[PDB]
Design a protein around this ligand. Sequence first.
Ligand code: SAH
Ligand code: SAH
Ligand code: SAH
Ligand code: SAH
Ligand code: SAH
Ligand code: SAH
Ligand code: SAH
Ligand code: GLU
Ligand code: GLU
Ligand code: GLU
Ligand code: GLU
Ligand code: GLU
Ligand code: GLU
Ligand code: GLU
Ligand code: NA
Ligand code: NA
Ligand code: NA
Ligand code: NA
Ligand code: NA
Ligand code: NA
Ligand code: NA
Lengths: 252, 257, 251, 251, 251, 251, 251
Amino acid sequence: GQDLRAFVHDSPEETETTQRLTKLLTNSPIPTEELVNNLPLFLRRHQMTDLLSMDALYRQVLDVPGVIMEFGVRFGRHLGTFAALRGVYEPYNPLRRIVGFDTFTGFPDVNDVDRVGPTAYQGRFAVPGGYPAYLKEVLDAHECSDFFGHVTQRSVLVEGDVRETVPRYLAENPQTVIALAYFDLDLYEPTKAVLEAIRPYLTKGSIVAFDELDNPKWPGENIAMRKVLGLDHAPLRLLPGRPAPAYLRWGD
Amino acid sequence: SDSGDGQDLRAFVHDSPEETETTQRLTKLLTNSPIPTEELVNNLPLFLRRHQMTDLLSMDALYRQVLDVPGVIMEFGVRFGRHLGTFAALRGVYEPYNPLRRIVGFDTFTGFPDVNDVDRVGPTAYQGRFAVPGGYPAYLKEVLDAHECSDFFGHVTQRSVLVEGDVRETVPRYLAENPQTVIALAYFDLDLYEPTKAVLEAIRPYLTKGSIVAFDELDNPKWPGENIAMRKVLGLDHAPLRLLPGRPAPAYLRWGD
Amino acid sequence: QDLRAFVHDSPEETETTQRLTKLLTNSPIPTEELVNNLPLFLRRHQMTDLLSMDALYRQVLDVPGVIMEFGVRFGRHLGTFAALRGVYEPYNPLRRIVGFDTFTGFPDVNDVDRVGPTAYQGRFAVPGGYPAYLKEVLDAHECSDFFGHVTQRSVLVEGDVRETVPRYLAENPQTVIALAYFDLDLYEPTKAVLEAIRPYLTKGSIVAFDELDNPKWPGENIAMRKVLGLDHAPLRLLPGRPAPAYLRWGD
Amino acid sequence: QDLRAFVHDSPEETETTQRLTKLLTNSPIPTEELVNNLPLFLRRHQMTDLLSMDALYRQVLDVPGVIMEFGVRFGRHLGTFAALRGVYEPYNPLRRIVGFDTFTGFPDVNDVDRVGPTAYQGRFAVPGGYPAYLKEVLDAHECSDFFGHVTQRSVLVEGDVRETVPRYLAENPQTVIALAYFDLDLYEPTKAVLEAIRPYLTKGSIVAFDELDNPKWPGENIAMRKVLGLDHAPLRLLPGRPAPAYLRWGD
Amino acid sequence: QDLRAFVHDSPEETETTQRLTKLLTNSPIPTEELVNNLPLFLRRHQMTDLLSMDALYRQVLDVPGVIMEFGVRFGRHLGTFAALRGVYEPYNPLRRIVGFDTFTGFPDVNDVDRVGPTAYQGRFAVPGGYPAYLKEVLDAHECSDFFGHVTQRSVLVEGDVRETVPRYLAENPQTVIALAYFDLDLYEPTKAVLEAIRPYLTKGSIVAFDELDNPKWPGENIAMRKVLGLDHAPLRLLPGRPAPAYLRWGD
Amino acid sequence: QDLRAFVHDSPEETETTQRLTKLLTNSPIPTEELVNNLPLFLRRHQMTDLLSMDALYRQVLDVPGVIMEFGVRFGRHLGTFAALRGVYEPYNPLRRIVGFDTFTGFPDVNDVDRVGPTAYQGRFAVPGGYPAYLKEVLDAHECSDFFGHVTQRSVLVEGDVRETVPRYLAENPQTVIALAYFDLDLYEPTKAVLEAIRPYLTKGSIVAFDELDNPKWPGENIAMRKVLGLDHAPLRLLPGRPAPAYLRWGD
Amino acid sequence: QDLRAFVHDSPEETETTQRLTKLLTNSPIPTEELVNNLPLFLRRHQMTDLLSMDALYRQVLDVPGVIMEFGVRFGRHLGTFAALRGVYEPYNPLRRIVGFDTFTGFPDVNDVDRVGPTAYQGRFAVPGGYPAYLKEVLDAHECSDFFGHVTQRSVLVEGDVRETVPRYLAENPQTVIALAYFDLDLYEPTKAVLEAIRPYLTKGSIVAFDELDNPKWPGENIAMRKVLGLDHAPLRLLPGRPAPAYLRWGD
Ligand SMILES: Nc1ncnc2c1ncn2[C@@H]1O[C@H](CSCC[C@H](N)C(=O)O)[C@@H](O)[C@H]1O
Ligand SMILES: Nc1ncnc2c1ncn2[C@@H]1O[C@H](CSCC[C@H](N)C(=O)O)[C@@H](O)[C@H]1O
Ligand SMILES: Nc1ncnc2c1ncn2[C@@H]1O[C@H](CSCC[C@H](N)C(=O)O)[C@@H](O)[C@H]1O
Ligand SMILES: Nc1ncnc2c1ncn2[C@@H]1O[C@H](CSCC[C@H](N)C(=O)O)[C@@H](O)[C@H]1O
Ligand SMILES: Nc1ncnc2c1ncn2[C@@H]1O[C@H](CSCC[C@H](N)C(=O)O)[C@@H](O)[C@H]1O
Ligand SMILES: Nc1ncnc2c1ncn2[C@@H]1O[C@H](CSCC[C@H](N)C(=O)O)[C@@H](O)[C@H]1O
Ligand SMILES: Nc1ncnc2c1ncn2[C@@H]1O[C@H](CSCC[C@H](N)C(=O)O)[C@@H](O)[C@H]1O
Ligand SMILES: N[C@@H](CCC(=O)O)C(=O)O
Ligand SMILES: N[C@@H](CCC(=O)O)C(=O)O
Ligand SMILES: N[C@@H](CCC(=O)O)C(=O)O
Ligand SMILES: N[C@@H](CCC(=O)O)C(=O)O
Ligand SMILES: N[C@@H](CCC(=O)O)C(=O)O
Ligand SMILES: N[C@@H](CCC(=O)O)C(=O)O
Ligand SMILES: N[C@@H](CCC(=O)O)C(=O)O
Ligand code: NA
Ligand code: NA
Ligand code: NA
Ligand code: NA
Ligand code: NA
Ligand code: NA
Ligand code: NA
């Protein structure tokens, strides 16, 4: 928009914390082999909040069959979270697949309704070339100590435009029930297409969550929700104190 | 020549002589206080009488009911801003980390712009009633900005927005300009039938199940417009209307219940 | 010592307070409408205090007896209770609000209270003749109470609590204390008052402290440890608020 | 037809009633203390009615709107509601109590109402000028209400409800109905008033009937079955009491 | 002494009471229908009393034993209990109601009772022969009880409770006390009766006080503090009502 | 066909039943004490029936209307209901118990009822003049009811329910049905009665079936599937008991 | 001495009882169907007893141990417990039912038991050879129990409980008592048995009294007050029922 200060942005202090913690992580006297035993030293409030919210969503579907999907993965923050939480809560559930969809090359197009702020452009949020192999190596590293680590395709990264890949994935996987659907695409067109595609695979109790439903910078999820279902189709909720995610329990 | 019996004005809610005395006494005690100037804002409950305290506690009760609902807080009918002040402070109490909880206040700031015959029950239903002074919205924006400058997210602007003009135009316009909008709490305090009806129709696509819709004068004989509006748009049994016990207003419903 | 290690206002909190002061005293709101729009000037920190007093009062609506504040200053909490009593208890003329203070600031301090630079005789003094003004304010709320014809529903007791609280209790053998709010900061009067009020509490009475765990004012904690022990009852916070700390007698 | 198959007083109920009437009119209690000792004369059957009106009113304390009674007679329930409103709602001047009656007894009956020997025009008539006396009684309660300066908080509407209820509603478009108490006995006015009040109920409003399943007075049942159906909402009793039967609108 | 600091009727309370007295004694309601319309004359303050007695009784419906009132005067509470016993306990002939009074007003007072100007020998006296009338009233209720054939289910015990309560208990070793209602006002007989009744309470018995925290009558408080302590059990109000204060024995 | 696939008494259940019959009819208990010791002769199977009837009755104590049994035989359940009504509802003279039967056994059967060897006309016939005796038993219970002076609180309707249930409803337009107990066994009369009673049920009324899922008597099931569907409401058991199966109307 | 102050049958209760006795003994029900229709003859007062025994038994379904009744007479409650054990505990062969009595009536009385005219030696005597018949009745129930092959699951112990209860316990050191039902009426044996059973109760065991607060039989109360105190545990009623009074051990 004109006044960029009306969009959510980091305070100078949030920026300082982030930069100091980056410096302390990369220049730490902690022995290299102990870094992964002390990561909360570097995990600041904003990111801790994200982790606790993913944990709250996952706990709500421990009694719901099916898979976890994220639309919009970037570097995989949420997928790493879900892989560890699946360890915590579901050692004996080899059917709880985690599926992450992304181009991995950033926004592949935008609609005029997404062009509110200056970051709505093709390629925004691109990750490095060959990143999906790295992210799959990370997920494989968590899986090798899972009780069901011998079962493969428990994590799947689907590369390309969700308008094509989500319907294709579903056609190839007619066993699918979706327990948790996490929408983090920002943009109107793919959100709408994916909401339409996933509907037959939800049960009553499935959770559908949105990372930017009510953000002025990214009105696409709301415009999509209003077109496909209506904002009062189901009860949208926050976890108190956190502006996102917004989430609904299908059928409520 | 013969005359009919007119309306008994005592049938409308009005201040008792004692309520008037309390109000006038506290006004004098505030304006002529021995408390040091800089401490007045640390002792305002000295001057906050039962009737106004009750309003504060009711706003707090409505806000607490939407702490787990996404979206914004809208007040239709702001006057000097009593409720917006209240919401700004409560948003600090409950939601330091929620920069999306916008507070949007709509008013002409020049009083009622017209009235309908159905609003013409008591003696204050006329154009301009409730006008606040020229330049008032700038002052109210200074007040809201003063609260915001100590908010955790005080660096994010447009978290309190005053929208000036007739809600029949400005509410549809605001919504068209803000397609991200979800409405968590919609506080109706316009009194009059026509703008109430128009705004109820406009806000519907932006409510979720669990959004609260509240009315300041729903069942008040002096201001039947909110009721007439609701009976036209939704029906009084569309959702369960509730009171906070012991308080004649607000009446509020939880959308979808 | 590092004064920064004591709780103090951020520059932004100071800015908000000063701007709201300026906007209240220079307002275009017509004079007779100011008391209809006070929340415009009631910032987060003070709103929180009001919500906490309301939470404490709501916990004793089913407990007999009176409300006492030890340490009144300008009367912020007494004004709050007077209005809340209107909201919740139109028909209870026995719910007396009793505020104790010298009204001339701390009358002495103990060495255990001298942690920060504001622990000195006379700190928090209010202007000469202030109690009459505070009583006029309380009388202004009472004149529209349902039981406004009953006097001594608010009582200001002037002097050192070491003498005045035992004297009040001896003069009022009907007393049950429903809510006892400790905001004296200092060790010695806190200890004396806790000892004095004990026989007038019931199970369910609330005892609250405004500075129990504050490094600047360790007197309430030193007093509680001497008289009862910190685990005599369950001390609690209202979540998100460092004070008050409060306990339900007998739990 | 056996009249013994209809509800009627046992010889013991009649003896209690007649004895209490004598003890009340010939009491040694000083005249100015009679109204401080009325439960002396309030027998189980009337006490039950009082407790039931209290239970219905408590269920709508969080529902906006007014209390209506269709079929007032001497005003037993109106006096009950006026006192309870004082107990529960000192600060609610919008809780109007509206009582509708011809005050001259049944104005007509339908053939379906003619089951027992008391279904005739004029049954339950009260004396000429009675409404002004009942209004004096309600005004006497109101002059000590917190909102006693607001008039028309108790309204007696005289005439046939088939005309007066629609007229009242037309003149009062602010109306929400929190509690609607049907005590007309007869089919036709019950049907007409049920139809009239529907747009003014909310989910959670209470609709109650005084004789819904009484063999002597099937008109409320016949009306309910025609307008709504008996399974439109859940009809309930207060356990142990044959009447009222009541439903929560929308359940 | 400021008599205005004691609870007293507002001019409007006095007006309501006097108007309702006039309207009851000059009523166009047919004489035989007065006892079917008593709520017309039952104002807020007295309705509140009735609802409180109902609340206390409801709490002992699962507790064995009898109901006792110490301090009956004209029998307001006994009338209420007799009707409620019919509503709740048709099949319980062991639920005796026992009322104790001199029926000649306070028989003595102690210095601690002499706070206000009504603490004198003979205050609250009722007329000569009043107990026989109150017994006739209670008998009138009982003649339509399911267990109306069992006598001595309502007992009036005349004399000073210091002698009569220990004597009643010695003559009735089957006694369990379910509800003990203290309304004597005075210190000495409250203390004596509290001491006497203790072996007959069970956990769950209710002990209630009519003036526990009233400045005019500190004797119940002084007595409680001597016999049990105010924190022996949790004293409670019914919210919004300054009395009774009651505790559940053993809590 | 294998008759052992139908429910039938074990040799031990037969021995219990025959022993207790002998012990009842040759008892050294004095004749006038037999009715004070009937549980001596009340075996597990029959005790279970009694407890289930009590569970169903307790579910409708807050629902208006009457109790109907379709299929009475000697009146086991009507006796049970008459006594329970005394236990729970002394003050409810509107809680009529209505029992329908030919009292001459099954009046016809349908091919779908002919699964076992007892589906024949006249099965379950009771002696000539039996309804007069059953009426004398019910009147014996009723003469110690609180409302024993009100007649027709127990009604025996003789004839084929296809004709008698619609006729009873037409003659009783006040009817609400709180509990409907189906024990006809046969398809056609169950279907006919389910259709007839529907306009007289409220949400919360209980509809119970004595043989819903028994292979010997599929007629209630066939009827339910025709009229409502088995998933119209939630059918339930009392855990541990194969019958009755019951639903709460509207759930 | 007014015998009317003791609980006694109304003329209507006597008429019910006498009618049902005649109807039982002159019944047109076939002899082999009498035990399938006993609720016909089971009036409200006895139905209540049955429901109360059921409520007590349900409270100990999660408590180990045996059921004991002190004071059996003809065995009303033992027959009830035998049937209930079948309903709830097919798979529990350790739930012994033990009934103690002289079976020749009261063997002596104490002066404290001599309040009414039935406190005499031999009151409640049952016929010579009665215990052998009661054992036949209990064995008839047991021969269709799932654990009917295990003997001694119901035991009749003949003699004075002062000797037989301590002897039984000494002989049965495995005993836990889940439910102890005191129905001896008399002071001395009640006290002796309360003393004896104490080491065999667990927290949650139920101790119940049939006449704890009955003026005619103060012995259970006197014994309680001597051995434990009436506030040792919380005594309760089943609401609406004067007896039994019961406590949960340890509460
Ligand atoms: N049509 C489309 N198909 C596939 N990915 C898309 C898309 N539109 C947007 N995206 C992806 O949406 C992502 C927002 S990805 C999200 C951030 C991430 N969940 C985190 O927690 O850090 C971008 O990586 C973008 O490439
Ligand atoms: N059509 C319309 N457009 C905008 N404002 C309107 C309107 N109709 C009524 N109003 C406004 O509704 C307000 C009613 S008074 C508002 C009171 C305020 N909420 C308080 O708490 O003190 C007036 O200021 C009036 O100007
Ligand atoms: N011994 C004593 N006797 C009486 N007052 C005392 C005291 N020691 C401390 N105080 C009082 O305790 C007060 C602390 S400041 C009280 C703040 C006030 N409750 C508010 O909410 O703003 C001072 O006014 C001080 O004079
Ligand atoms: N069509 C109609 N219009 C107005 N009143 C009617 C009516 N039909 C019946 N009524 C009134 O219904 C009343 C029934 S008696 C009401 C009893 C009263 N509620 C009490 O508690 O004592 C009569 O007074 C009768 O006049
Ligand atoms: N020592 C004593 N013995 C007996 N009665 C006493 C007493 N001391 C006080 N009383 C009685 O206590 C009573 C107080 S007034 C009782 C009010 C009554 N319960 C009501 O509800 O209206 C007086 O009647 C007085 O005579
Ligand atoms: N069409 C019909 N009309 C009337 N009664 C019928 C009927 N069809 C079956 N019945 C009756 O249904 C009864 C089934 S036996 C009922 C058993 C009884 N309720 C008990 O608890 O012991 C028979 O008496 C039979 O005559
Ligand atoms: N010391 C003692 N020893 C044994 N039995 C005693 C006793 N004192 C009293 N009893 C018995 O207590 C019994 C009281 S009557 C018991 C009634 C029985 N429970 C019923 O439900 O009908 C008498 O049979 C009497 O003999
Ligand atoms: N949805 C992402 C990115 C938002 C953005 O960059 O605007 C987040 O919450 O951090
Ligand atoms: N709704 C505003 C104004 C009412 C009016 O002026 O009538 C209030 O409650 O104070
Ligand atoms: N207790 C007071 C004063 C604290 C101080 O000055 O140290 C407060 O909370 O503001
Ligand atoms: N409905 C009124 C009157 C009934 C009648 O007279 O029949 C009552 O319950 O008393
Ligand atoms: N306790 C009695 C008497 C009070 C008095 O007279 O002082 C009451 O509440 O009315
Ligand atoms: N329904 C009856 C009869 C069963 C039958 O005869 O088959 C019962 O449960 O005993
Ligand atoms: N306790 C036995 C006998 C009572 C008696 O005979 O007094 C009963 O409840 O019937
Ligand atoms: Na976000
Ligand atoms: Na209002
Ligand atoms: Na503090
Ligand atoms: Na009725
Ligand atoms: Na009192
Ligand atoms: Na069956
Ligand atoms: Na008994």
